[model samples]
Target: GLWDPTLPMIPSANIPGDPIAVVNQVLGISATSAQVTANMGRKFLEQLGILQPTDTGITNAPAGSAQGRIPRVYGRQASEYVIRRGMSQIGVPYSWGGGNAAGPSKGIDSGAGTVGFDCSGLVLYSFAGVGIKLPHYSGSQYNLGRKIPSSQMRRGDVIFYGPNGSQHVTIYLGNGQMLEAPDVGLKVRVAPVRTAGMTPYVVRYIEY
Candidate 1:
């Protein structure tokens, strides 16, 4: 669903009786649908290769093997590292431009008392814990990494969405589900990458 700026950005703070609540209030459904649409849009960009599945499983080979890199960390090592670190902050609230090292705070809990995170901040904290220093914002993160064509996206690539600059980012964890921070009032969660609305742009950072 398109976010209405006039309304309070926090999903929990919206008018209790508003119709939008039916859709937005259920993060698993509404947000998952949005993500699926985004993944389908990426698939439409190229059709020659096999499509990623929506369930959880590791592909033997990475997407766009020609562009793949051997990660400094290999095998289950890197995968477990990313997943464990991400899962640790599952219930953290959303905050806008919060948690920047240069900003007033240092962690996801910084904005938990209120509407917690904007997309990128969650990514920053998740990856940072694993020793990866990603850009502080979604747009910058998208640009910082190698541009993987939609057909070439592999697990762990950063999928970007929204306008000219990325307004959101999600970690494409193979299959078709991703770890995403989503919007305000929602905790970081994993949902299908393919949804019914927005299209996503893909970028890869890990090689193996």
Candidate 2:
């Protein structure tokens, strides 16, 4: 899924020239070649099974303590599902607001055909699969849940970075690494959480 800088961008020249000429200009290679590339991309996604239909049910489990007695949406499990699915597309190119919509065949933004996604877009798409609707951007998403001390953080909590004006978000996956849609050129990958230098904040969307 990594961006292949070598792939040339095909241009459309439908305005003045003949349609066949335009086709020839871009397809100096054969149409079959282009179709093959398209097919490969489709097949790659199909292998991930992200485009298949999914159940939107929300599952929850209860902890025994008073606070834990409250039902907690299986947010952690849902997020894990997203991380596993996203990991399968590790090299997919980044696109701004890509994969923000709901439905099958709606993930993976390749920066071509307006079909890719940026950081928060990836997060939104991942959670959407499990019936959790998150804000479309990092900062807004950070504000969706109650802030908790990092020591109190649990799996499925959101970790925020940047200060004064918060700017980034990553879902705490319980381990040291967080499932995040980093900046451009970075896919939704797991990375270490910066708790000190960046003034990290934790927010819990589902109480447990």
Candidate 3:
């Protein structure tokens, strides 16, 4: 009769349970931390505040927004547009010197929106989605944006290859894959980072 029993209703060891749950409850939107970054932005508004975070979040925003855009993938409108538009050409064939209204005759499957893209052509076309006019040459492209360390590269960054005077380039696909046209006879596709064996390379990340 002197024995006692523990109750399920009792709190254990004076401990606080699941502190993060309290944080989630405080935020009240039921979103994970990843969702917050996606909606608000992965990049802090560095140079300007024209690009602002919204509760709507980039993932839920219209495809590239209502301004004929493509990404809305990343918070930076320019970067999001570039990556989003680039993804649209994942299966397009590679054409040497393809693209550009004034481009050489390397474009194939020229049906518009699927005309195909070369190394630089893909980069040029994708950035064009956000009103950026990049040159068709990879060497020339190397000078367009800021040169960041390879370790610092991001989703919309440009990756270069070959001699600086005769280089090829691709769009960084974020997960170590580079979106590229590869070479003539090789269709446009995603390939491993080492496929572009040219070394001592620099990454150019667009600030827009």
Candidate 4:
């Protein structure tokens, strides 16, 4: 007999890993990538000292922080609040000229009878939570905020499409996603950002 060898056990490298399972094991939470992104966004804001670690599920800290006579909020925390508030209305149906600073209401014209939000209506309502008042018209709202290049867009940035940024408007939700109320037959939802007829720059009302 020349030689022989005994080796320790080894695992298969070809085995595939599941994202859902990996997240559960590593973070003790199971969530889709979209959900993870949204959650992580808040986490990032908290880590940046913009939001409190305990500001979860819309308890109104960002907005509540402005409790006194001063009716305005700023910084990334306020932006996060805007994004989260917009996300909360995902299933609401679209109603042209429906939503307002007080919340959803019946639309007018072709959108009559439907109780929900139109494009700008949704934006107006979301920002209203943090005491930022935007006009009901998309075109007017477009001119109210600080304009930034598309590449600089972040969560809570208001994006517009079509002529003079008037045709449609939605809140940017970071990572190429947006919160929208869409058209008459549609509903509030998270959708991929569209640039086909989008404005050259997105607008930011809440500072930071």
Global lDDT scores for all candidate models: 0.48, 0.46, 0.50, 0.64
Where is model 1 poorest over a 10-residue stretch in terms of lDDT?
Answer: 13-22
What tens-digit string does per-residue lDDT give for candidate 3 at 1-208?
Answer: 1111211111111111111111345666453323333323323332223344442223222212233212334336667656877777777776655654122124433323334566776776666544454556776666555566667677777776554513567787778887876654557678766533343545544443
Model 2, C-alpha of 32: deviation from truth (Å): 34
* Model 4 Cα lDDT, one tens digit per residue, 1-208: 1111111111101111211211346676654322333344455445545565554422222321323211244367667777877888889988876776555667777578988888877887787655555557777777776778988898878887765776778899889999988876788989888777677889877665
Q: Could you tell me every candidate's TM-score relative to the true structure? A: 0.55, 0.53, 0.55, 0.65
Across 1-208, the per-residue lDDT of candidate 2 in tens digits comes to 1121222222111112111101255657433212322333344334444333332122112222223211344334444665565555455555544544231122233443444555555555555444344545655655555667777677766676554214455677777777766554555567776564233457665554
lDDT winner between candidates 1 and 4: 4
Model 2: ten consecutive residues of lowest lDDT: 12-21
lDDT of 1 by residue, 1-208 (tens): 4322422322211111111111344565432222332333233222323334542211212333433222343523544555666666677655654443111122234354554445665565454432344545665666554566665667776666554234566777778888866654567788877442223457655555
Candidate 3, clashing residue pairs? 39-57, 94-188
Residue 29 of model 1: what lDDT?
40
RMSD of 3: 24.6
Highest TM-score: which candidate?
4
Give the residue spans of candidate 3 off by over 4 A: 1-75, 101-115, 195-201
